[PDB]
């Protein structure tokens, strides 16, 4: 059964992760942050939440939206690194694979050369070498071959999306092989959503480039999830936004949610739906993925509110994405 063997290693981990899940800001707490009138007031109000005294070392004059975002991200990353440190075996590898996505993001962001690592979870020993790796030819055989991204590799957006294709395919395979049934299903669905988001975004990026051949996207579209293979192939053959709409007309989910409204808002909303659903499984490691995404969205919302009270423009303060 699910929980018979789960708690041998992951019971403490999973309990602590849903403990954090209880600490996610509720809609009422987001409202309270919205009604704030200054960054110090937001600091105090957010200290009234489960964040506690994290900006306690920051004075109101040093306090800025950038510092608030950095401290929230640092708290999230410390919690994730605690859970990963307390993890072993299959869950440890699962969390390492979660980190590989941020590793790929860091690779793409740093090869742009200024651009630093900009993400603590994607750090690896040779990451800053990528700031100085102007020659893309030397990339793999010099830098990345030492990194866990070596199995994935075979303008920069091409490299980023190829790495994401290989990474998502490998991680779907790992989820299928090494993860128990409830967490297996939950993570497979979450990866279907992630690969669908990647495919849609990559198709809309190819919309702006004439050199985006349909077969070129085959190296780029993960072909994972509900869109696969059919809607993925249609997006590969798609030439414009009308092609994307025609491709997405063939699926139940994510239909009618790119023709209107903000696309990022809809992807984040569906992601929050999936994370909320994933939290319902009681002995599943997918709770970790749901927690990570929920916390990332929480940090985004907090930074959004911080901006809306630091630069005013409060008409936009209520457009944060939350299911809690």
């Amino acid at each position: 059964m699910e929980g018979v063997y789960f708690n041998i290693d992951n019971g403490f981990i999973e309990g602590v992760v849903r403990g954090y899940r209880n600490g996610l800001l509720s809609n009422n707490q987001y409202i309270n942050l919205t009604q704030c009138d200054t960054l110090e007031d937001l600091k105090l109000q957010l200290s009234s939440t489960d964040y506690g005294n994290f900006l306690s070392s920051v004075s109101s004059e040093s306090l800025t939206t950038s510092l608030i975002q950095e401290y929230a991200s640092s708290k999230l990353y410390h919690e994730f690194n605690y859970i990963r440190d307390q993890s072993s075996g299959s869950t440890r590898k699962f969390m390492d694979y979660i980190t590989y996505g941020y590793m790929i993001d860091n690779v793409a962001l740093m090869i742009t050369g200024i651009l630093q690592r900009c993400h603590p979870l994607g750090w690896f020993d040779t990451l800053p070498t990528l700031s100085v790796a102007t020659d893309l030819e030397s990339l793999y055989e010099t830098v990345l071959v030492d990194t866990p991204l070596a199995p994935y590799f075979k303008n920069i957006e091409i490299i980023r999306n190829k790495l994401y294709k290989a990474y998502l395919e490998d991680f779907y395979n790992f989820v299928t092989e090494e993860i128990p049934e409830p967490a297996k299903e939950c993570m497979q669905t979450l990866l279907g959503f992630e690969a669908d988001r990647r495919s849609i975004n990559i198709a809309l990026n190819s919309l702006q480039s004439s050199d985006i051949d349909p077969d070129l996207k085959s190296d780029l579209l993960p072909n994972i999830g509900k869109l696969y293979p059919l809607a993925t192939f249609h997006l590969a053959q798609a030439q414009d936004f009308e092609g994307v709409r025609a491709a997405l007309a063939n699926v139940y989910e994510y239909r009618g949610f790119l023709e209107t409204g903000n696309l990022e808002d809809h992807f984040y909303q569906l992601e929050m739906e999936l994370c909320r659903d994933a939290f319902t499984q009681q002995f599943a490691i997918s709770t970790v993925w749901a927690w990570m995404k929920s916390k990332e969205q929480e940090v985004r919302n907090i930074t959004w509110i911080a901006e809306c009270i630091a630069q005013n423009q409060r008409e936009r303060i209520n457009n944060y994405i939350s299911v809690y």
Partner: protein, 200 residues
Amino acid sequence: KFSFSHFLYYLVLIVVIVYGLYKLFTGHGSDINFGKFLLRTSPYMWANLGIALCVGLSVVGAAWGIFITGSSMIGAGVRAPRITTKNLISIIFCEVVAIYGLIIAIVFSSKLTVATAENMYSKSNLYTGYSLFWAGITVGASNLICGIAVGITGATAAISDAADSALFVKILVIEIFGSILGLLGLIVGLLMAGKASEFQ
């Protein structure tokens, strides 16, 4: 597709099938005489295996439920240490499972007596050997099952109580059902061994 455990399973299955066919074809099928194995085998092996497996499987189930629910409630207790004393009833009902096995082991140990060689393999001694063996297995396995179930349910209860204290109450009913399962196992073991005489 290969695994060493399944390889041995299939190997021993093949060996047993071949041996059975060899004995049957040669007219010596009655050599495989499980009934005579039950008759000749010492009743004390059955009785002491019953007691040992009763307490051992009761303890295995109790411990299995205990670490499931205890690890879950310690993890959930990191944010809410209040969860410990509230959900400790789960650990309690897991332990009661092993206490059932201990009680049954005491009752069955009351039956252990030195039977005379002239009366060693009588109807009564064989009956009580089988009775203690299977009653100990019944109580121990039911206790193992109930301990695992109560541990899973109490882990879920601890996590839900961490989410909200109002969700705890109705999961305690599930824990009560899990404990009733083990109580029924104990009483059925008592009934199975109720009419089993001492070794005489």
